[PDB]
């Protein structure tokens, strides 16, 4: 799976988490087996204005 976040939000992407991203955008299983992999993308994704 893949998606864009702001740099605050990383902590909600863990097994069985809660909060607006976990509960209203993208929910991991409570017994999720896998890896979560992320990077700052300011250079790829930000724009002036």
């Amino acid at each position: 799976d893949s998606f864009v976040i702001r740099g605050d939000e990383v902590r909600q992407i863990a097994p069985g988490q809660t909060g607006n991203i976990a509960d209203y955008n993208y929910k991991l299983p409570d017994d999720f087996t896998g890896c979560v992999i992320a990077w700052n993308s300011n250079n790829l994704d930000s724009k002036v204005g």
Partner: protein, 49 residues
């Protein structure tokens, strides 16, 4: 006092059953021995422990 052999059978089973019941109230190092506390105060990942 004469029927000691029979009265002791009743007394030992009364002590065994009452001790087995009183152990429901013991914490065993958990946050509470009242299960409804854990089922209302904690999220699943903590409540499982």
């Amino acid at each position: 006092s004469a029927l000691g052999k029979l009265q002791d059978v009743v007394n030992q089973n009364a002590q065994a059953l009452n001790t087995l019941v009183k152990q429901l109230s013991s914490n065993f190092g958990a946050i509470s021995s009242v299960l409804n506390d854990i089922l209302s105060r904690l999220d699943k990942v903590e409540a499982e422990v």
